[model samples]
Target: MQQSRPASDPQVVEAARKEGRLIIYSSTDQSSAQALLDDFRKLYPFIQIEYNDLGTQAIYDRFVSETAAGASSADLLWSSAMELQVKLASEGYALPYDSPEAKNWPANARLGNLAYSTTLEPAVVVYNKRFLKPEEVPTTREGLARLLQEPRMRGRVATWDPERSAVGFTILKADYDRFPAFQELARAFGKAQAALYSSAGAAFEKVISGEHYLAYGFFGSYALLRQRTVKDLGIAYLTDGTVAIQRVAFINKRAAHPNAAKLFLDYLLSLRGQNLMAYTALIFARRETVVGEATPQALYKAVGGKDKVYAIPVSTEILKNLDPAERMRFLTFWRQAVR
Candidate 1:
């Protein structure tokens, strides 16, 4: 855990302007982050930013490998693999700089000034409205389990393959911890011969194409983005609850441009940047800052209020469930039940 007082906004800005470049390695799609980055450039045109979007595990692995080799790597790392980000920061790979926007953010959003949760995306149940009539749409995981028993959906449901995707594993782990019936749910998926994809977008794509009727554990924000062009898709939160994951961002300890990294990190957490985020980034981390129906407050009401909106905290505890021994034990059971 590295710790240091944050530089004043003006001082950080001045140093960042001198540095002139920022490289960000993120798991978020380019389209999603591009708009925010574009807005950022307008604010500080002197600073050039390079955004690289990759898979969650890929982002983590590359950063670790690049840093160890003393090679040039991302100045900031932003990813949806909450545990892996926390793990990296814990290992002293992160530079700790308290942000001026820290007071406005939720306490859990900042991890001792080492990592910050930048966006909130809900894990939702997305169904093809054309195939799933209102009464047929499952609003809860338990309801989904029952729906899987129907012969029509035997091979028509899709979701992430936890074995290959870090985000997939996170959602499964959270569900297992929060829902006692998770084991039975896994078995239900196997019985349905459920299809699994390595990416949420792929899973949801199948649903929209009518190749699959439903997609579980898909990101709602992504769905909203897709819905702009695809109208057949309908998103539903499990009546039991839905897990909200945050994309964690942090400056690298060995960053080639530390000042610029700090400036960019602060901007992402600031009100103006978050305003751009609320509109184009799908959802912002601050509830009060979010706009449109996709906001957390709206999501809470739509999902039957506060109790049903389960926000996964960005913390080291998420790493405990991913311990090799524990992970293998859970995977062993999951394989037997899901496949």
Candidate 2:
């Protein structure tokens, strides 16, 4: 799987320079994505980044609609919704490019040269620091369940509604596996009247305002970065079991700026790009070589090694639940147990 190509393919660089743009339909929020965008813009000054920050499903929905209608769609699509990204790849909507940097990415992270898994952000509990004390922060699912059902926590605990949020379902679905106490967790959610949300930013805002004491299954990267600037935020790395999700990215088969898109994807997996992702953007880099101030490795060690953190691999296996009937069955069980 490790193939050596030139450090930079001169042909692709020249072609990308001529292409002059990379339109990305992405799920990464604008504020979080700007750090990576600025650096990419600085290096590839000739290429303009037409970034479209939309919801997880919105990115998939619009791209499919546009592509199906014979219109120019995004040159690249990136999302935390790995299932949807892989679905597009399996459906032949994504193009395969043999990126030399794939040598650094893990085997489980690459979809046979078609799609690439980018970030290694964990699903964590983010709480309002001003409201929840350090001792009150829980590191185990059992503790989390107890906290949610506490009298003071009534109507204040929030988590993503798996039915509405792709990221939500990814975390919660995996979370359900790790937490066999699913029924107890859901019963507690009912007791606490846990609120549901689809937007990551708004959920964080609710926590920031103390409207929601804490959010279960929030992306660790978002909480980590937000905690740096916001005094009200607190992060809890659950040890009973937590999921590490990747932000998957791929080029469209009929990209208007195919060369630029490939160049950008290559940059995203490059050692330099990975470092910027970790240090600058506060997102985890997938490269074993790229070490940052904070990484999944560091977080894993802090959380008692990999035994407690389950990193979801990039595989077609995720597509199993994408089936309408399959998802309906899963959701039916989830609703019954959680409500």
Candidate 3:
């Protein structure tokens, strides 16, 4: 098989300059995209990027529908829902462009030059410091289950509804594989009468508002940024195991601006872009490169070891549970245990 590689920076820049614009469908929030876009535009002043922020499944659904209609669509698709992105690439909906920064990442970060993981975000527990005493906060799945039984803590927890949210489903599917306490945790959630939301922001908001004392499987990166405004919010990693999902990016196979898409994809994985993204995007893909709580190193250390951090990489392995029959079976059990 012939090897495929990304176009040189000069060639891509010249072509992208002529293209003049790029459109991206992403699940990343507006502020983060705006910050990254501000930096991206400075480097390539000629190319204007239009970023469309949507829900994880919404991004996938729109892209698929647009592609089916043969209508003009986004140049790139970026989403935190890792499985859907990987499946799209696996099913031949993604353009293959081997990024210049490919060598710097672990093999799993790049999916055969088709899809690239741009950010690593952990699934963590967020709690309201005002309500949770030091000893009451959970540091593991079992600890959380035990905490749910407490009179004050019962009916005071929040999390995502796996049946309703794509990201939530992905996290719980992975949790089922890694933790033996998964089923027990579901039962505990039911017993505690846990509130569920479609967005992590909602769950975290409830935690900070005192409507809920704690939330499980909240996005750690989002929590890190939320702490800037919500001072009483705190993040806790499970001592036994915690899930880390990588936000993935891929050029659309039918991209309206192919060259511009390639340029943006390469820029996102480049060293300078990675650094800028770390601070502004609030998600870090490379360990030891970004300091503070978001880096993989910091997360591993906080969780007590690298083994405790279940970093979901870019791969087709996640697709197994996504099958229609398999998903229905999983959801059947999930609904029963969780409610």
TM-score of each: 0.92, 0.90, 0.93
- Candidate 1 lDDT tens digits, 155-264: 88998898888788888878877887777788899989999888877787789889999888888888887877888888887777778888899999999899889878
Give per-residue lDDT, candidate 2, residue 272: 72
Q: Give the TM-score of candidate 2.
A: 0.90
Candidate 1 wrong stretches, greater than 4 Å: 1-8, 283-286
Point out where model 3 deviates above 4 Å: 1-8, 286-288
**Candidate 2 lDDT by residue in tens digits, 268-296:** 88777777788877887776566654576
Please give the clash total of every predicted structure, in order: 1, 0, 0
Off by over 4 Å in 2: 1-6
Tell me the whole-model lDDT of each prediction, alpha carbons only: 0.81, 0.81, 0.82
